[PDB]
Amino acid sequence: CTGVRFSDDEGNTYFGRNLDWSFSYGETILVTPRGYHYDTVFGAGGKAKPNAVIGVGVVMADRPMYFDCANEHGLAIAGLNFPGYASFVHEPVEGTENVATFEFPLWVARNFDSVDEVEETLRNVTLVSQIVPGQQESLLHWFIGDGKRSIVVEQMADGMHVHHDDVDVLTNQPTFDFHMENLRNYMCVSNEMAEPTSWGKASLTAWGAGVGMHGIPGDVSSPSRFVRVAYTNAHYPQQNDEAANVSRLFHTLGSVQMVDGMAKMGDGQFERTLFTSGYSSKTNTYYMNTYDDPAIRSYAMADYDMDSSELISVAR
Amino acid sequence: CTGVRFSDDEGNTYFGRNLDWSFSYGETILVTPRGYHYDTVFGAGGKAKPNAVIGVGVVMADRPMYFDCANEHGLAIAGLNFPGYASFVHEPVEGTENVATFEFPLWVARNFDSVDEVEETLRNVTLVSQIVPGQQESLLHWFIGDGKRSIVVEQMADGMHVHHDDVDVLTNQPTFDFHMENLRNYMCVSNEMAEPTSWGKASLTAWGAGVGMHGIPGDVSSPSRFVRVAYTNAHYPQQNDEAANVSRLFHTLGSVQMVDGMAKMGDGQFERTLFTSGYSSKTNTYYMNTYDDPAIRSYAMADYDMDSSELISVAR
Amino acid sequence: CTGVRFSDDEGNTYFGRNLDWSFSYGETILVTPRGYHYDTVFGAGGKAKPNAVIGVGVVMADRPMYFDCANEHGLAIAGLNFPGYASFVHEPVEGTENVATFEFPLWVARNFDSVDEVEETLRNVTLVSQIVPGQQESLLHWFIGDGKRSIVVEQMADGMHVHHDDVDVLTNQPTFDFHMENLRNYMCVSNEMAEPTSWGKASLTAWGAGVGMHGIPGDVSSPSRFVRVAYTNAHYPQQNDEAANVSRLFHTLGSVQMVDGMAKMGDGQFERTLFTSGYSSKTNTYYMNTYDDPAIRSYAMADYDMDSSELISVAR
Amino acid sequence: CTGVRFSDDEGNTYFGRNLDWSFSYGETILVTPRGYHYDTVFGAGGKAKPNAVIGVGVVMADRPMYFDCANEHGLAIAGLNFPGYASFVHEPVEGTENVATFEFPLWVARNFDSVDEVEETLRNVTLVSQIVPGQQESLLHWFIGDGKRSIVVEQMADGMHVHHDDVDVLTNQPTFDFHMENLRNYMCVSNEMAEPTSWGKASLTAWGAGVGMHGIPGDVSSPSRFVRVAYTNAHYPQQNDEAANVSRLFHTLGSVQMVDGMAKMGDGQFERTLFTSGYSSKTNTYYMNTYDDPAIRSYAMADYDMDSSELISVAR
């Protein structure tokens, strides 16, 4: 998985994520209208008046289990895979806001309007994992963005770490700090045409474009994707209209896409970019394409009786 | 630019390309019916009854100048940029079949039914480059594929080189031999899960997928792209239906796409994958998407009257 | 800087380090005999009966300021550069063993016989940096080894971290954890002859030796040296005599040597491997060569009235 | 194997090589006085009065078979392994000067005073490889240097290639052209301190020296070694005295030495830098150290009577 955020000139949110796995089924654009009543697993609180939210997910037990989701005030949250690092308490803590790991995305998008607001509340959050005997625990870290900035939430054995994500990108393992240090290896990688230069008597020139970018890794490991996407996000020229920012988003992501055959998982199955989802706060629209179909599909929030009362789950 | 060929299990051709540049030239899907009368610039001969052809290209002086094209009999060709290496005579040679560099793709698609045929005729072909005030010579090499195999044509100052392209992939500079040697650097790159090993007492394990692929370059240089796409094409699992094979084609070419901001050219503009086109002989359909719109559009030779006699530019 | 440790069959200590900087002067093989009276800066304690120690260093104020040193019972300590990470209190803590940063090497080698012993005492050590107004603080981390194992001492803002160094190598920045995670990128690098393999129809073979090792970085940055030396240390065959282990040591180090012209520091001067020092516990001998002279010089402890009373400083 | 040439500011030759292999052949320092009578195997002509020569090699049938050697007039030559590419006729060609592959180094050192002279004569040289039951042909290429410049001789199935070696370096396979193209991948690798830059809001800085050199491969493959040593040789600051230049030579060759355990050959043995030799025309001295002993031994032509008439193997 890979998440990405950036902005336009008018401080609109563009937030996007790859969902990378061997296979997926049943997930859907899923609307949680303002009229839906939501009972929080461990009686965490929330706004008297909930935000409309849209995202990609499944409904388990008439609750929306979001991979990623965004609200009508430009705030977006994606959960990404983090086993080996992610580590949670299994009991609520008295006098903290106790949020079940799977509702966390919904919670943050129902109740907050900015990263500022989210970050502030996190200071008193416990992220409870409820263990199911047959079912393996979801072990994630979270990329959260609005039109100004992103943060990274890494709950681990030693506690909850909330990072300012100055490169506006996230992947998988290992820790955010590691990835940030690692970037420094690549600090000389450039998008400029390679300047002619000499080694002794030998004149070196670039065949063409991309030579200054040499040193960037091209494998689909988590750290390499982190670096490649960080580079691409940071060097993509600012855009100023919706069409171009959604293009930006989707090209940026998928610059670290996982193609069939590239890379097997632990079980010997090839990991693939099964879908790419995005959110625009300019249009409060969610977008999506899949491995089987690159045509981007849009899901305007205003489409969408947000004053309604039940989860809507839209197919195709 | 990048070219890719593979088959399915029924000997059908899947062939396609990325056209990387800073600006479009007005190219379009371009049908050349069998009834179109074509007079080869240097009087190269031809099939009594030409093959139908479709491709992406431009009309200049009522001649189709294809970037890439394919015929009804499963043969496809792309021209890719090759300055610094491509070098041609400007005058026909007596006794040879003299083919203008710009008509070469049309010429092959129209007159040959297989790579065997083409390869055979190339032994008596001269590739002639017309000087045009005060445009620069177009200095390309060509990737040619059918259901069985691909070849590479590099006409250079030392003569015409025709290579068997065992990796079914082509990029830009330098020579084909260079690239094939270069691959050997990456022969330990693996799509398998990296297995646990120790350095001294330190046990090393992979975070997850893609660590075995570590070593593959991630930049958009010509050689880096050749290696990435060769890898990707050689590891992608064989597929058995049109839609999976088209998806295979496009994701494969996506693995080496150029994203805005990655790499400037010599004029200071970013090189980008403006479009990606493809061909299936199963369906005799041409496919295409663009930087602006990843939705793949199809253009079946069926939907056009190949008995007709005029050039058809199809706007999209 | 780079430190290295390994062992033979008979559990003798081999410990070595590169000293890397633009220039050095006045350092010397320096013997601290058992008869020298040592007044510890902050009244840290120590054995009634001190270990003989030998090392490379300078004497400031009739005290031995050791770069690296080793004792007569096979324990060795090297300090390596760590600015940006290393961070110390400037006042002694009551009821801890307070050890001045510059005496730390001497302290550990005067008073301990094993890594076990050192590690145990560290649990109650404060590492005080005394600031001198003109003089910039020495900001190091420490590689410590005996014939069984090595540890790494990183005193930083958040406290003292003492790592088990399972790869038996240390360099400079960033943190030991980072370096350990980073190694995982290289876990497929092999010393085996690259097995012939095929990408599609194309057969790939190795030109010769070293192809399986491709993916190892070759620059002289701290992280790259860490990886390169870790690989070389872990893959070097065990040796069983002194000559061969000192060879092992010195080849291993210097596999990450810094050559003039390679790499400028912050001040624009080239960083070089100015000397390489080592220690054998089989012979309680210290060895050394320099940039200007690769001939290894030996300094047998028994040479060397260790029951004497003053620092000896041996030149050439 | 690796070869290196540079000068000082007075036009003197500094020339040397790493001989990488699994096992020694019994080579020694080997003096060939002007009085030694030599009958070229295929009757190649020669200077009326031959140049004195010293080198490292073996005596077989009372003929000196040099790995490398140099003459009193500042000209040096090394043979380096080149199987897969080196290919020779086995019979002399009428009218050419036919030189046995094993006598080629002796032959050049004896008869020529400069690279200009040699290059000139190579236009009429045939390199002949004697079949020997049931030894394998020695399949080398040659690096030839004086005070001004180096050339590379690659006799292959398509003919004899003589290259101007503008980087003053040579390794093994593949062809020289390959390597020179390959260098262009690394044209942004810098010995400068990597300067602070930002990716988005993330400020990237270097830990210290060597981050600008990031991208240089660290493995001991032939191509990786060519790139590392080309880099190192081209960036090493010009030096002006014998000792600094010899130190320059040896550290430069050390940057691509093979350490035990790094890389197996096809027989399963580790390839190692068995010895490193060098030459100075300033002093007409040959230099050498070995895997076992990094102390550099000198062998001045002065200390031998070049008017004598017998081969002198000097044991070390």
Short mmCIF file of N, CA and C in Angstrom, two decimals, chain C residues 151-267:
data_model
loop_
_atom_site.label_atom_id
_atom_site.label_comp_id
_atom_site.label_asym_id
_atom_site.label_seq_id
_atom_site.Cartn_x
_atom_site.Cartn_y
_atom_site.Cartn_z
N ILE C 151 29.15 -5.14 21.31
CA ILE C 151 28.01 -4.29 21.59
C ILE C 151 28.31 -2.91 21.09
N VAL C 152 27.23 -2.15 20.95
CA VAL C 152 27.23 -0.76 20.48
C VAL C 152 26.64 0.13 21.52
N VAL C 153 27.37 1.19 21.86
CA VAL C 153 26.85 2.15 22.86
C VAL C 153 26.47 3.44 22.23
N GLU C 154 25.17 3.71 22.19
CA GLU C 154 24.67 4.99 21.67
C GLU C 154 23.92 5.82 22.73
N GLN C 155 24.61 6.82 23.25
CA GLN C 155 24.06 7.76 24.23
C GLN C 155 23.51 8.91 23.44
N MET C 156 22.20 9.10 23.52
CA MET C 156 21.51 10.12 22.78
C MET C 156 20.57 10.89 23.68
N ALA C 157 19.76 11.74 23.08
CA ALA C 157 18.96 12.68 23.86
C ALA C 157 17.99 11.93 24.74
N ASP C 158 17.53 10.78 24.22
CA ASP C 158 16.51 10.03 24.88
C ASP C 158 17.16 9.00 25.75
N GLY C 159 18.47 9.04 25.93
CA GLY C 159 19.13 8.10 26.84
C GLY C 159 20.14 7.19 26.18
N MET C 160 20.61 6.23 26.98
CA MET C 160 21.69 5.36 26.63
C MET C 160 21.14 4.05 26.07
N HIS C 161 21.56 3.73 24.86
CA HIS C 161 21.13 2.51 24.17
C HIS C 161 22.32 1.66 23.99
N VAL C 162 22.15 0.40 24.34
CA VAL C 162 23.27 -0.52 24.33
C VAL C 162 22.76 -1.66 23.53
N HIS C 163 23.32 -1.84 22.34
CA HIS C 163 22.82 -2.84 21.36
C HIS C 163 23.73 -4.05 21.30
N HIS C 164 23.09 -5.21 21.24
CA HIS C 164 23.78 -6.39 20.79
C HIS C 164 24.09 -6.30 19.28
N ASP C 165 25.37 -6.38 18.93
CA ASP C 165 25.76 -6.15 17.53
C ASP C 165 26.09 -7.43 16.82
N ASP C 166 25.01 -8.03 16.41
CA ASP C 166 25.02 -9.34 15.82
C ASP C 166 25.74 -9.43 14.51
N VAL C 167 25.99 -8.31 13.81
CA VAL C 167 26.81 -8.30 12.60
C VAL C 167 28.25 -7.90 12.84
N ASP C 168 28.56 -7.49 14.06
CA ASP C 168 29.92 -7.25 14.48
C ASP C 168 30.69 -6.19 13.72
N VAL C 169 29.95 -5.15 13.40
CA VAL C 169 30.42 -4.01 12.59
C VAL C 169 29.73 -2.70 13.10
N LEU C 170 30.48 -1.59 13.00
CA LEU C 170 29.87 -0.31 13.24
C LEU C 170 30.48 0.74 12.34
N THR C 171 29.67 1.74 12.07
CA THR C 171 30.16 2.90 11.25
C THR C 171 29.90 4.25 11.96
N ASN C 172 29.14 5.18 11.34
CA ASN C 172 28.79 6.44 11.89
C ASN C 172 27.27 6.59 11.92
N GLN C 173 26.72 7.73 11.48
CA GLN C 173 25.26 7.97 11.51
C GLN C 173 24.55 7.18 10.44
N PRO C 174 23.25 7.00 10.61
CA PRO C 174 22.43 7.29 11.77
C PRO C 174 22.40 6.17 12.87
N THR C 175 21.26 5.98 13.53
CA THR C 175 21.20 5.04 14.68
C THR C 175 21.44 3.55 14.27
N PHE C 176 22.01 2.77 15.21
CA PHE C 176 22.24 1.31 15.01
C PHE C 176 20.97 0.59 14.48
N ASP C 177 19.80 0.97 14.99
CA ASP C 177 18.54 0.36 14.54
C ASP C 177 18.33 0.56 13.05
N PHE C 178 18.67 1.75 12.60
CA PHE C 178 18.45 2.10 11.23
C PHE C 178 19.28 1.21 10.33
N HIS C 179 20.54 1.15 10.64
CA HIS C 179 21.48 0.34 9.95
C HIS C 179 21.08 -1.13 9.89
N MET C 180 20.61 -1.65 11.03
CA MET C 180 20.08 -2.98 11.08
C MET C 180 18.88 -3.22 10.22
N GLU C 181 17.91 -2.33 10.23
CA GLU C 181 16.81 -2.43 9.27
C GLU C 181 17.28 -2.33 7.80
N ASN C 182 18.19 -1.42 7.53
CA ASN C 182 18.65 -1.18 6.19
C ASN C 182 19.28 -2.40 5.55
N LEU C 183 20.03 -3.14 6.35
CA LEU C 183 20.64 -4.39 5.90
C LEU C 183 19.64 -5.31 5.20
N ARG C 184 18.38 -5.23 5.64
CA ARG C 184 17.41 -6.13 5.14
C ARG C 184 17.17 -5.96 3.62
N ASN C 185 17.34 -4.74 3.12
CA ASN C 185 17.32 -4.46 1.67
C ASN C 185 18.26 -5.27 0.88
N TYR C 186 19.40 -5.64 1.50
CA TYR C 186 20.46 -6.37 0.87
C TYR C 186 20.53 -7.87 1.11
N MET C 187 19.46 -8.43 1.63
CA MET C 187 19.48 -9.80 2.12
C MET C 187 19.66 -10.92 1.01
N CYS C 188 19.41 -10.56 -0.23
CA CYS C 188 19.57 -11.37 -1.39
C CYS C 188 20.95 -11.29 -2.03
N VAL C 189 21.78 -10.36 -1.64
CA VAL C 189 23.14 -10.26 -2.11
C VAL C 189 23.89 -11.56 -1.69
N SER C 190 24.61 -12.19 -2.63
CA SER C 190 25.20 -13.46 -2.39
C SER C 190 26.62 -13.48 -2.82
N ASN C 191 27.40 -14.35 -2.15
CA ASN C 191 28.74 -14.58 -2.62
C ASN C 191 28.87 -15.76 -3.58
N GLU C 192 27.75 -16.40 -3.87
CA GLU C 192 27.71 -17.51 -4.82
C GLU C 192 27.76 -16.99 -6.22
N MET C 193 28.36 -17.80 -7.10
CA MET C 193 28.33 -17.54 -8.49
C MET C 193 26.85 -17.46 -8.95
N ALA C 194 26.55 -16.39 -9.65
CA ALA C 194 25.22 -16.10 -10.20
C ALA C 194 24.78 -17.30 -11.08
N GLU C 195 23.69 -17.90 -10.64
CA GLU C 195 23.08 -19.04 -11.34
C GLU C 195 22.44 -18.59 -12.67
N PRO C 196 22.80 -19.23 -13.79
CA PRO C 196 22.19 -18.94 -15.07
C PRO C 196 20.67 -18.99 -15.03
N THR C 197 20.02 -18.06 -15.68
CA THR C 197 18.60 -17.96 -15.53
C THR C 197 18.01 -17.29 -16.76
N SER C 198 16.72 -17.30 -16.92
CA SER C 198 16.17 -16.84 -18.13
C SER C 198 15.12 -15.80 -17.87
N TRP C 199 15.13 -14.73 -18.66
CA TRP C 199 14.03 -13.77 -18.68
C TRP C 199 13.40 -13.95 -20.02
N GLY C 200 12.23 -14.56 -20.03
CA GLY C 200 11.62 -14.97 -21.29
C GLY C 200 12.52 -15.94 -22.04
N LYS C 201 12.82 -15.64 -23.29
CA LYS C 201 13.70 -16.46 -24.10
C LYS C 201 15.17 -16.14 -23.88
N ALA C 202 15.46 -15.09 -23.15
CA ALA C 202 16.79 -14.64 -23.00
C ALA C 202 17.49 -15.31 -21.82
N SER C 203 18.57 -16.01 -22.13
CA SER C 203 19.41 -16.61 -21.16
C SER C 203 20.41 -15.62 -20.58
N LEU C 204 20.37 -15.47 -19.25
CA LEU C 204 21.33 -14.60 -18.53
C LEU C 204 22.34 -15.39 -17.78
N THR C 205 23.61 -15.09 -18.04
CA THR C 205 24.73 -15.61 -17.24
C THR C 205 25.62 -14.50 -16.72
N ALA C 206 26.40 -14.87 -15.70
CA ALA C 206 27.39 -13.95 -15.09
C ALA C 206 28.63 -13.89 -15.99
N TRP C 207 29.22 -12.70 -16.20
CA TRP C 207 30.50 -12.62 -16.92
C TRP C 207 31.58 -13.43 -16.20
N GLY C 208 31.46 -13.50 -14.90
CA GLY C 208 32.45 -14.04 -13.98
C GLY C 208 31.89 -13.82 -12.55
N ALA C 209 32.80 -13.87 -11.59
CA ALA C 209 32.58 -13.61 -10.19
C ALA C 209 32.09 -12.12 -9.87
N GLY C 210 31.21 -12.02 -8.89
CA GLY C 210 30.81 -10.80 -8.23
C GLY C 210 29.41 -10.36 -8.60
N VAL C 211 28.86 -10.99 -9.65
CA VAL C 211 27.50 -10.72 -10.06
C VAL C 211 26.40 -10.99 -8.98
N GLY C 212 26.53 -12.10 -8.22
CA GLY C 212 25.60 -12.32 -7.16
C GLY C 212 25.71 -11.21 -6.10
N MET C 213 26.85 -10.52 -5.98
CA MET C 213 27.00 -9.47 -5.00
C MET C 213 26.40 -8.08 -5.46
N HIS C 214 25.89 -8.05 -6.69
CA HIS C 214 25.36 -6.82 -7.21
C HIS C 214 24.17 -6.39 -6.31
N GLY C 215 23.99 -5.10 -6.06
CA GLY C 215 23.01 -4.56 -5.13
C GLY C 215 23.71 -3.94 -3.90
N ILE C 216 24.91 -4.37 -3.57
CA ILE C 216 25.73 -3.76 -2.55
C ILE C 216 26.21 -2.37 -2.98
N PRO C 217 25.99 -1.37 -2.12
CA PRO C 217 26.44 -0.04 -2.47
C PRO C 217 27.93 0.17 -2.34
N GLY C 218 28.49 1.05 -3.15
CA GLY C 218 29.90 1.25 -3.13
C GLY C 218 30.45 2.57 -2.79
N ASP C 219 29.56 3.45 -2.40
CA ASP C 219 29.93 4.74 -1.92
C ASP C 219 30.46 4.63 -0.48
N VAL C 220 31.09 5.71 -0.02
CA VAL C 220 31.70 5.76 1.31
C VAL C 220 30.84 6.55 2.33
N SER C 221 29.52 6.62 2.11
CA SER C 221 28.67 7.14 3.14
C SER C 221 28.59 6.14 4.25
N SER C 222 28.26 6.65 5.44
CA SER C 222 28.17 5.84 6.65
C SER C 222 27.24 4.65 6.46
N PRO C 223 26.02 4.87 6.04
CA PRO C 223 25.18 3.67 5.85
C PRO C 223 25.67 2.63 4.80
N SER C 224 26.20 3.10 3.68
CA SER C 224 26.74 2.24 2.66
C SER C 224 27.96 1.46 3.14
N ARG C 225 28.91 2.11 3.84
CA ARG C 225 30.00 1.43 4.45
C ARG C 225 29.47 0.38 5.45
N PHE C 226 28.41 0.71 6.21
CA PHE C 226 27.93 -0.23 7.13
C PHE C 226 27.52 -1.54 6.45
N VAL C 227 26.72 -1.38 5.42
CA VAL C 227 26.25 -2.50 4.66
C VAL C 227 27.46 -3.26 4.02
N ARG C 228 28.36 -2.58 3.36
CA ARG C 228 29.42 -3.23 2.62
C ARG C 228 30.30 -4.04 3.62
N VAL C 229 30.55 -3.46 4.79
CA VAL C 229 31.46 -4.10 5.76
C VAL C 229 30.73 -5.23 6.46
N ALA C 230 29.44 -5.04 6.69
CA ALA C 230 28.69 -6.10 7.29
C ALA C 230 28.73 -7.26 6.38
N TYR C 231 28.55 -7.04 5.08
CA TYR C 231 28.56 -8.17 4.15
C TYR C 231 29.90 -8.90 4.17
N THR C 232 30.98 -8.14 4.03
CA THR C 232 32.29 -8.66 3.94
C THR C 232 32.69 -9.41 5.25
N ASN C 233 32.38 -8.86 6.42
CA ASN C 233 32.65 -9.52 7.66
C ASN C 233 31.90 -10.88 7.80
N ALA C 234 30.66 -10.91 7.39
CA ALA C 234 29.81 -12.03 7.57
C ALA C 234 30.17 -13.15 6.54
N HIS C 235 30.80 -12.78 5.44
CA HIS C 235 31.05 -13.77 4.40
C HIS C 235 32.50 -14.20 4.30
N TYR C 236 33.37 -13.56 5.03
CA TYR C 236 34.76 -13.93 5.05
C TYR C 236 34.90 -15.32 5.74
N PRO C 237 35.60 -16.28 5.10
CA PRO C 237 35.74 -17.59 5.76
C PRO C 237 36.54 -17.49 7.09
N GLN C 238 36.05 -18.14 8.12
CA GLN C 238 36.84 -18.34 9.38
C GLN C 238 38.24 -18.74 9.16
N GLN C 239 39.14 -18.07 9.86
CA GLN C 239 40.53 -18.40 9.88
C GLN C 239 40.95 -18.85 11.30
N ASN C 240 42.10 -19.49 11.29
CA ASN C 240 42.60 -20.28 12.44
C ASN C 240 44.06 -19.97 12.79
N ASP C 241 44.66 -18.95 12.24
CA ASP C 241 45.97 -18.59 12.70
C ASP C 241 46.03 -17.07 12.70
N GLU C 242 47.05 -16.55 13.37
CA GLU C 242 47.16 -15.14 13.66
C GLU C 242 47.40 -14.31 12.36
N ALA C 243 48.27 -14.81 11.50
CA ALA C 243 48.68 -14.15 10.32
C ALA C 243 47.44 -13.89 9.43
N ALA C 244 46.70 -14.98 9.25
CA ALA C 244 45.47 -15.00 8.49
C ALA C 244 44.36 -14.23 9.14
N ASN C 245 44.22 -14.27 10.44
CA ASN C 245 43.19 -13.39 11.02
C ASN C 245 43.58 -11.90 10.95
N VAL C 246 44.84 -11.55 11.09
CA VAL C 246 45.23 -10.12 10.98
C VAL C 246 45.01 -9.67 9.51
N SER C 247 45.22 -10.59 8.55
CA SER C 247 44.98 -10.33 7.14
C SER C 247 43.45 -10.12 6.96
N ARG C 248 42.70 -11.06 7.47
CA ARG C 248 41.30 -10.96 7.42
C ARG C 248 40.87 -9.59 7.89
N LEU C 249 41.46 -9.14 8.99
CA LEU C 249 40.99 -7.94 9.67
C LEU C 249 41.22 -6.76 8.79
N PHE C 250 42.55 -6.67 8.41
CA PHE C 250 42.90 -5.57 7.66
C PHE C 250 42.23 -5.62 6.28
N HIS C 251 42.03 -6.77 5.53
CA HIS C 251 41.26 -6.68 4.33
C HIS C 251 39.79 -6.28 4.52
N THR C 252 39.16 -6.84 5.54
CA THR C 252 37.81 -6.51 5.80
C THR C 252 37.61 -4.94 5.93
N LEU C 253 38.38 -4.35 6.83
CA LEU C 253 38.42 -2.94 6.98
C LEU C 253 39.03 -2.38 5.67
N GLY C 254 38.57 -1.27 5.22
CA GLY C 254 39.37 -0.93 3.97
C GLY C 254 38.78 -1.52 2.68
N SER C 255 38.01 -2.58 2.87
CA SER C 255 36.94 -2.82 1.99
C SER C 255 35.92 -1.65 1.98
N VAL C 256 36.02 -0.89 3.04
CA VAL C 256 35.28 0.32 3.22
C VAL C 256 36.26 1.43 3.47
N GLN C 257 37.48 1.23 3.01
CA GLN C 257 38.38 2.41 3.10
C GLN C 257 37.92 3.65 2.24
N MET C 258 38.35 4.84 2.65
CA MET C 258 38.10 6.08 2.01
C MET C 258 39.38 6.55 1.35
N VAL C 259 39.29 6.72 0.02
CA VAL C 259 40.41 7.02 -0.77
C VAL C 259 40.36 8.51 -1.06
N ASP C 260 41.53 9.13 -1.15
CA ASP C 260 41.59 10.54 -1.51
C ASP C 260 40.75 10.80 -2.82
N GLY C 261 39.99 11.90 -2.82
CA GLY C 261 39.18 12.33 -4.00
C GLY C 261 37.76 11.81 -4.00
N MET C 262 37.47 10.78 -3.21
CA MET C 262 36.18 10.12 -3.29
C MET C 262 35.04 10.97 -2.80
N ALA C 263 35.29 11.73 -1.75
CA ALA C 263 34.20 12.25 -0.94
C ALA C 263 34.68 13.35 0.02
N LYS C 264 34.21 14.53 -0.24
CA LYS C 264 34.46 15.68 0.55
C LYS C 264 33.54 15.75 1.76
N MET C 265 34.11 16.30 2.83
CA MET C 265 33.39 16.59 4.00
C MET C 265 32.68 17.96 3.86
N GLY C 266 32.01 18.36 4.94
CA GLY C 266 31.35 19.67 5.11
C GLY C 266 32.24 20.85 4.89
N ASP C 267 33.52 20.68 5.19
CA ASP C 267 34.46 21.77 4.97
C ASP C 267 35.14 21.72 3.55
#
